[PDB]
Design a protein around this ligand. Structure first.
Ligand SMILES: *C/C=C(\C)CC/C=C(\C)CCC=C(C)C
Lengths: 163, 469
């Protein structure tokens, strides 16, 4: 058994908390469950402070919603600098929340009223290679599409650090 | 495969150097990147056997290297650390760290210590062995040296010292009590102009500062003053990492009631507020933390901080940021805390004007029950003292509607203080509009009565106030 920790971060948390509560099968403990080689993942008065670099964090999931390209463009300015300074060497996974509402009648039409359109996977990978991500992966909270593929990817990112 | 390993492991008992080297090379691959097999090697159990080897063949170079890589790999498994703690490995790694000098050979030993150190019991063993001594000498030598190897050997030793101070037993041994012989030498890092040492020092301090007694004995010996000098150095720009570490220590030093006073007199509240402008959430967080701790029993301090319009305006600004929302929470609680501790009509008028009522109201519907009534109590104060100046913003916030929802509950005894904020808010003409929304049916049910004696009475009195006047 190997314990790895997963922080997760993004604009509005009805997009993100949707991502981790769907794996029931600010503190939570899921598993594999347990496919025979066991990997466990913990999630996100006196304060105890950790140096850098020996952080109690093995991988960050930077979340943006596909229905808001504002929430994608905020990534480099609002989320990345924090991680830059405080969690360096911690691998990142960029994550497009709610992939189901892309070509939709209600929400690409409502996005036009912002002079805008939904986020492409080109714009996603462009940001991922920009912020220095370990990888990218879109996923839908409500339709269960690509959800396990994020936690697959997160775990692979965590493990990769004889004689 | 248990067929394969059993003999390979029984080979490890060989007094022959060459035998080990090969049986090692074998054991090596596979299990290379096969944690399944590595895990079985722990059960065997090879760990205590390997620690013995390292001990006997330390003046050898070839296997000693290979031995360390094993430990570094094995330590990544959970089972390993408890097993490692039985071992003499703490003593044996330090005894090695002294002997070896080359930069490459140390960094290998460091990459074993770091994961093994996470085990709180190993920490103590390492300190007892004298790792702390070596670590400090590595810092001292290489403070003003600018060799890229030397600055990273500094960072390792300094940050590892910090790590060691997370173990409660180990830390308490080093804080001797502060001032001791190590703690002193770590303190001196905060006056220093080595950006890393500043960081380490602040963090070390904060980690020392993790029980009432230690935090007292530090505030009295002028740690609070030294931390402010560090903050005053990093005000305009730019090392956010250090701002945080220093703030984070103050926050801890301001936990016990005794120090709350003493720190206000030294003027922490002033120096801390210089980072109101900061746009870095972790710095924003430990700012708001340290304020909320400084004002806890102190009313007059809270009266000035409440009156301070610069601050209160920033708080209402942070409350209304959708993200993070780690900093949103801490901010929202301070708004309550300013009102609650000062009990000042002025600080209320400051907050209602900054637009803070609508936030205190939405905090009353928080999932954490402590925060819930902090909002309700701060709202109780708002209504008792300055209901006129507040009542217009209060209808806007839909407070009356929330309180009815609150009092048909699944549930809390915090419903009492709501039945008081209802009783008190009732005497405002623009105010409810609770009779136009029918609370009387819920109040007489609760009158007769919750398991709490106190919950019954105000509710039975609220029944009489809601029928008569
Ligand atoms: C990748 C290396 C692994 C998994 C560990 C292999 C080595 C051992 C097991 C221990 C052998 C060490 C000596 C014989 C000194």
């Amino acid at each position: 058994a190997i314990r790895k920790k997963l922080v997760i971060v993004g604009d509005g948390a009805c997009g993100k908390t949707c991502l981790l509560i769907v794996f029931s099968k600010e503190n939570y403990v899921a598993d594999i469950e347990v496919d025979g080689k066991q990997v466990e993942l913990a999630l996100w008065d006196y304060d105890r402070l950790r140096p850098l670099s020996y952080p109690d964090t093995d991988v960050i999931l930077m979340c943006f919603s596909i229905d808001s390209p504002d929430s994608l463009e905020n990534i480099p300015e609002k989320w990345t600098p924090e991680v830059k300074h405080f969690c360096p060497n911690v691998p990142i996974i960029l994550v497009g929340n709610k992939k189901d509402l892309r070509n939709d009648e209600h929400t690409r039409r409502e996005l036009a009223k912002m002079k805008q359109e939904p986020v492409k996977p080109e714009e996603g990978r462009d940001m991922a290679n920009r912020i220095g991500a370990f990888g990218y992966m879109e996923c839908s909270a409500k339709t269960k599409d690509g959800v396990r593929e994020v936690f697959e990817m997160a775990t692979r990112a965590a493990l990769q650090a004889c004689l | 495969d248990a067929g394969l390993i059993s003999p390979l492991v029984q080979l490890l008992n060989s007094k022959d150097q060459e035998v080990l080297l090969q049986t090692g090379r074998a054991l090596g691959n596979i299990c290379y990147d096969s944690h399944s097999l590595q895990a079985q090697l722990i059960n065997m159990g090879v760990i205590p056997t390997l620690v013995k080897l390292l001990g006997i063949h330390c003046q050898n170079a070839a296997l000693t290297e290979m031995c360390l890589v094993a430990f570094g790999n094995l330590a990544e498994l959970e089972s390993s650390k408890e097993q490692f703690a039985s071992t003499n490995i703490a003593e044996e790694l330090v005894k090695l760290f002294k002997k070896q000098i080359e930069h490459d050979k140390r960094e290998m030993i460091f990459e074993v210590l770091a994961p093994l150190a996470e085990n709180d019991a190993i920490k103590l063993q390492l300190v007892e062995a004298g790792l702390v001594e070596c670590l400090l000498e590595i810092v001292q030598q290489k403070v003003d040296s600018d060799k890229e190897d030397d600055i990273t050997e500094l960072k390792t030793g300094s940050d590892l010292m910090v790590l060691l101070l997370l173990g409660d037993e180990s830390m308490q041994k080093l804080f001797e009590g502060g001032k001791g012989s190590v703690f002193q030498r770590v303190l001196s890092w905060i006056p220093s102009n080595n950006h890393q040492l500043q960081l380490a020092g602040a963090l070390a301090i904060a980690n020392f500062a993790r029980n009432d007694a230690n935090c007292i004995h530090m505030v009295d010996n002028g740690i609070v003053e030294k931390l402010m000098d560090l903050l005053d150095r990093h005000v305009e720009d730019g090392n956010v990492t250090v701002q945080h570490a220093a703030l984070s220590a103050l926050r801890n030093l301001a936990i016990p009631v005794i120090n709350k006073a003493k720190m206000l007199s030294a003027g922490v509240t002033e120096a801390v507020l210089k980072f109101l402008k900061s746009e870095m959430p972790p710095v924003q967080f430990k700012l708001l933390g340290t304020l909320r701790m400084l004002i806890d029993a102190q009313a007059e301090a809270a009266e000035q901080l409440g009156k301070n319009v610069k601050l209160v305006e920033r708080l209402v600004e942070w409350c209304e940021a959708k993200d993070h929302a780690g900093v949103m929470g801490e901010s929202n609680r301070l708004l309550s805390a300013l009102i609650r501790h000062s009990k000042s009509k002025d600080v209320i008028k400051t907050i209602v004007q900054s637009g803070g009522i609508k936030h205190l109201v939405t905090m009353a519907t928080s999932e954490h029950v402590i925060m819930q009534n902090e909002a309700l109590v701060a709202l109780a104060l708002i209504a008792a003292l300055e209901l006129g100046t507040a009542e217009k913003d209060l209808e806007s916030a839909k407070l009356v509607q929330i309180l009815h929802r609150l009092l048909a509950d699944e549930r809390s005894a915090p419903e009492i203080k709501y039945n008081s904020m209802v009783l008190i808010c009732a005497l405002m003409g623009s105010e409810c509009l609770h009779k136009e929304v029918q609370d009387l049916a819920f109040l007489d049910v609760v009158s007769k009565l919750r398991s709490h004696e106190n919950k019954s009475v105000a509710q039975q009195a609220s029944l009489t106030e809601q029928r008569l006047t």
